[PDB]
Amino acid sequence: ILDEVTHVQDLFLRGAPIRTNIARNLALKENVFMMVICIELKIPLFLVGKPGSSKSLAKIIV
Numbered sequence: 440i441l442d443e444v445t446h447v448q449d450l451f452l453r454g455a456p457i458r459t460n461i462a463r464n465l466a467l468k469e470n471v472f473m474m475v476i477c478i479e480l481k482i483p484l485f486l487v488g489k490p491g492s493s494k495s496l497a498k499i500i501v
């Protein structure tokens with residue numbers, strides 16, 4: 440299940456334009472994948488954290 444989830448996250452990140460000098464950590468992948476899904480389904484997303492949690496970056500890439 441974990442492998443399938445990370446595979447879909449990598450797939451969705453691949454769908455987004457390739458960005459150089461950007462980290463493929465679980466943060467960015469999960470953020471972008473879940474915001475794509477949530478705004479697709481009209482369900483709210485509430486990303487939080489601290490400076491460096493790939494939330495605004497995920498917003499811009501989406």
Ligand SMILES: Nc1ncnc2c1ncn2[C@@H]1O[C@H](COP(=O)(O)OP(=O)(O)O)[C@@H](O)[C@H]1O
Binds near residue numbers: 460461463467490
């Ligand atoms: N894996 C990563 N996670 C967070 N920030 C990254 C990552 N890779 C690169 N960055 C840098 O972070 C900057 C914006 O991301 P970030 O500041 O983390 O967003 P947020 O506003 O959510 O903190 C970019 O200029 C980018 O160079």
